[PDB]
Symmetry: C3
Subunit: 341 residues, 3 copies
């Protein structure tokens, strides 16, 4: 009659996240600046459901999750479906970790996002860049992913393969595979990742992409922590064209009592096409943040960033190639709250 | 091991609402009448999540809500996302009330909707009317809203500002601000509200709208209750054109035991443009309802209403201006159930 | 302070369902085969909410349900709204069963789907077929449905009427009615169903459809179970054209310990238009499945099927009529898990 935790086969969880963000654009077109700029609220709150089940006739524990999307993000309309964020089934066992099937982060993307896209470095380092094809997927459906245990309390591997965006609609045969490794060494973690995308259709060509990443994260007892990554992107099109672009991201943090101060920088360097540098195809971003640990479950923050994007390039079909710079340079001031339950 | 209310950081709530509604149109086109008319089910059921948190390092209590949309309304397809209805974060404290950020009702809209759009008066008084620009927003994202306490057990204020519809997509610089006040005087409540909309783009112009509302609600011990409102809408276009339209809504109720009888009437008067009345631009609606208090948590009702809309007008771009009358006059017979948990 | 089942006015339930499915198409176009074929994940997981309420002033118990859609099906994008699957309100009482209003299965469709579209027979027997108009609705909004009690522990009836697809958007006056009966005797159940669709607009005509179904299901104590159905579809267009097509579906199962072996076959026979057979308008499918009862709440399965579809036909507007064969023949190998809570 009285309920326990074991009375339920699911749990509801959530991340309640609201950011008030003011953007100031300098696109070269005053009307476009007025349109894209100004104050918005960016409600990234989401609700999820998850659970486990020990099946009577199978030793590896069954796991599942269904996570909703952002309920009212800036630059978007209201409402999100269930299953827009990480949404999967899987199995887990102590000696081999876990396997998930469904919609998850790629091993490469997980590292690109965290630590290296925070705070607000994502327009440059996450989905920014100028290279053709698909540098990497991000959160991707039709994926199988293995997460190894922490071998010897030090070393872990994340590996995955999946269908591409067109393949997921029965509209292509794109696919990808990726792997990441992590090694804990005193106050450091060393990171490495790879992703290969294949049969990518864009700009009248079929592309193969190969992306490589190396990184470090460090946490010291005096309150200083940091990260740094280098990311190398290569792409080859079916007409013989080769492209290369690299990038970096770094962050420095100082944590004292209930406060964290943070500086971030990321850059994409000029793209190279068939051995020739395309001028002014670089991007960078600098960001500063103060965060207050308002509760063990929540943070408040204030953030200021400046994005300086590339000046444009054409793709292999002689039309403009869309990038995160297409809408123009901008600065952003924001405040926010994130609460977890 | 055993759970209490305090074991959870959220609560699920819902409004289960189903209306069977038969419409009889007289548009002037028999096929359009057949299409728009007939029986539908209007399933306005919705599920929401809400909660609070006392952050360790901040006195004002944190609040949040994420409310789903109508799951299967008439004239619409099935399915609603989380966050389509009131969806926000905020803080509250006894001495100053509450502040919410996100998607909420405007102070004006809240009064227009309740009491004054019920029962079925909304096609005229809520989103009906012929004025250009944006008379007011309704439920709006990118909003900050303050709700005062009840000062001296008599007086309260609701105030808000927010981004407009285009601004929320990075496609404009529209915005609005509004305020409402409520004063309790014996068996009466006096209401007043304002909303100003700015930088509204429509019909080739930029518009400013100013809307004003005054109202009364009464509840007497003999079972009679009522409301009445007057609403004045003004609009000025960037080409110099001025428009004005006013409106009213009233309702009379008699409650005895488990029954409420209700009569409603609302009208929009003829629109004026640059000092000249546009003939046959008025609308009105009469509605009758019987409601049964089937449970402390639920009602059953039967409702009959007749809408007589305007005969059309052009906007400032020499094309027809859409109104709630564009689809034609209709009557509607309905029955329904609403249950709250 | 401590919670019981009665502390809540709702319950969350779910079906967690994941299928890894590899398709091999032979459409006649190698690129289309590459696009439609390959491996996808078909995540048919969904979350629902349901509950009941005994209203103080009405004897029949109030019931309601809001069921989410498939969170990430194959050939589709991520995310589902609440209310995409069976979503209704209703009342129930011991002596007369239950009545539901909202979005439910039609009586015909319920039998077509279960038992007769399993395993993977649906491309042929569910939404397959070549007949014009609307052979039947499936899961349909704007419906009222009665489910009788099990009279004398043997006999039950399902009856429903509803608005059509266009009517639900205010874009037509289509509607339907249907009924099914079930009779249980010893190890058998006998099934019969009917659906009539009216005012269906397609191919420049208005159509009336009448579909009839008879079936048997058997379950024996030695572990053998089976089903078989015959389905007869007739359609008449407003220009005088008559069409007829019939179909069947059958399955054989052997259950021993924690295993079920299953073979399925379904076929649509050649369509007849105005008394003339249209050659090569048939379809069939053969399917084999092994299922493991991995837990009382879950199954694992492996499945192989071969679809051989019709070679095409024109509708009454001299353009190709879309069928489940339009994309071409294919075979599919799959494995999956389904878990209920
Ligand atoms: C181990 C760990 O995680 N520890 C804790 C840590 O998590 C905690 O901090 C929090 O971490 C999480 C996880 O890292 C952070 O979550 C991230 O938050 C960012 C945003 O803040 C998310 O960024 C989004 O990424 C998606 C991709 O997944 C972006 O997609 C792009 O969206 C843009 C919109 O601007 C699109 O632009 C438009 O595109 C079209 C055409 O394509 C064009 O026509 C339009 O004009 C154009 N632009 C317009 C209209 O302006 C763009 O197309 C699209 N990209 C495409 C198609 O390729 C999305 O926009 C990003 N969001 C933005 C921007 O706001 C990020 O995904 C998310 N990560 C994950 C994994 O979900 C979280 O931010 C962080 N919180 C804080 C406060 O820092 C901390 C506690 O703080 O504790 C650690 O221990
Ligand atoms: C303090 C308190 O609250 N006390 C209790 C009280 O709550 C209880 O009574 C209940 O109260 C609630 C709150 O007042 C009531 O909830 C309201 O219910 C109505 C409908 O029942 C909701 O009305 C909707 O409002 C929105 C926003 O304004 C409408 O949006 C418009 O929708 C129409 C659809 O027809 C659109 O038309 C189409 O438009 C396009 C072009 O734009 C055109 O091409 C199409 O042809 C056209 N039409 C077609 C296809 O038919 C229109 O575009 C759009 N808006 C625009 C353009 O701006 C929406 O349609 C309305 N829906 C209706 C009507 O069905 C209202 O929003 C909602 N309020 C809130 C706040 O959410 C509730 O009804 C009430 N219940 C009962 C039983 O009376 C009472 C009793 O329980 O107790 C008190 O104590
Ligand atoms: C009593 C009882 O239930 N007992 C237990 C039993 O339930 C348990 O087993 C499980 O049973 C359930 C219930 O029977 C099974 O659930 C069913 O599963 C199937 C799918 O596996 C569902 O099928 C869907 O049906 C809908 C409606 O008919 C389909 O809609 C169609 O989708 C196609 C897909 O492409 C559309 O095609 C596209 O259309 C456009 C335009 O026309 C075209 O341009 C595109 O090219 C085209 N194709 C593309 C892009 O590829 C099509 O248009 C549309 N419909 C129409 C009318 O047009 C939907 O697609 C089907 N799903 C597909 C395909 O995957 C079925 O609805 C569902 N039933 C219910 C009621 O929801 C479940 O499968 C079963 N599990 C197992 C493991 O077998 C068992 C234990 O497991 O125990 C019993 O006791
Ligand atoms: C980018 C590397 C950051 C290194 C921070 C310094 C860590 C050790 O310093 C010791 C002095 O403070 C005590
Ligand atoms: C992390 C080491 C510091 C590297 C700084 C130079 C990186 C190049 O940035 C381009 C600036 O122009
Ligand atoms: C300021 C308070 O004003 C209250 C007056 O209410 C007038 C309502 O009249 C409506 C007429 O239809
Ligand atoms: C508190 C008492 C409220 C009394 C409300 C009386 C409202 C009178 O009815 C107004 C409805 O008008 C019907 C049509 O008349 C059109 C004339 O247009 C000009 C309006 O003055
Ligand atoms: C002269 O009147 C002709 C009717 O024109 C249509 C007006 O619509 C009904 C409006 O009712 C409210 C009047 O204020
Ligand atoms: C449509 C053809 C399928 C018919 C197959 C029926 C096989 C059933 O075999 C019956 C023999 O039963 C032997 C054991 O009987 C156990 C008691 O069963 C009670 C009723 O199921
Ligand atoms: Na703007
Ligand atoms: Na938004
Ligand atoms: Na992708
Ligand atoms: Na109709
Ligand atoms: Na609907
Ligand atoms: Na609006
Ligand atoms: Na494919
Ligand atoms: Na999918
Ligand atoms: Na349908």
């Amino acid at each position: 009659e009285y309920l326990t935790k074991d009375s339920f086969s699911y749990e509801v969880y959530g991340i309640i996240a609201m950011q008030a963000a003011y953007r100031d654009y300098d696109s070269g077109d005053a009307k476009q600046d007025d349109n894209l700029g100004g104050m918005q609220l960016n409600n990234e709150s989401r609700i999820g459901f998850r659970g486990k089940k020990q099946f009577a006739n199978f030793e590896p524990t069954f796991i599942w999750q269904i996570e909703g999307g952002y309920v009212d993000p800036s630059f978007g309309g209201e409402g999100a479906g269930l299953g827009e964020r990480d949404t999967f089934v899987g199995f887990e066992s102590a000696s081999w970790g876990q396997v998930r099937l469904g919609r998850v982060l790629t091993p490469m993307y997980e590292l690109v996002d965290w630590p290296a896209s925070n705070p607000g470095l994502g327009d440059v380092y996450d989905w920014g860049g100028a290279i053709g094809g698909a540098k990497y997927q991000d959160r991707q459906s039709n994926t199988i992913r293995w997460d190894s245990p922490m071998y010897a309390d030090k070393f872990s591997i994340d590996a995955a393969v999946g269908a591409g965006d067109k393949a997921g609609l029965g509209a292509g045969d794109d696919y990808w595979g990726g792997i990441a490794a992590h090694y804990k060494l005193g106050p450091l973690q060393l990171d490495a990742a790879y992703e290969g995308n294949r049969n990518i259709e864009a700009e009248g060509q079929t592309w193969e992409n190969n992306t490589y990443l190396v990184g470090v994260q460090g946490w010291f007892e005096n309150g200083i922590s940091f990260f740094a990554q280098y990311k190398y992107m290569e792409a080859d099109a079916s007409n013989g064209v080769n492209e290369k672009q690299d990038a970096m991201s770094a962050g420095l943090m100082y944590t004292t009592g209930d406060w964290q101060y943070k500086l971030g920088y990321a850059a994409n360097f000029d793209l190279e096409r068939d051995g020739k540098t395309l001028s002014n195809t670089s991007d960078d971003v600098v960001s500063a943040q103060i965060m207050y640990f308002v509760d063990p479950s929540a943070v408040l923050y204030a953030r200021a960033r400046m994005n300086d994007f590339n000046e444009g390039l054409d793709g292999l079909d002689d039309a403009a190639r869309w990038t995160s710079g297409t809408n123009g340079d901008y600065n952003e001031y924001s405040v926010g709250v994130e609460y977890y339950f």
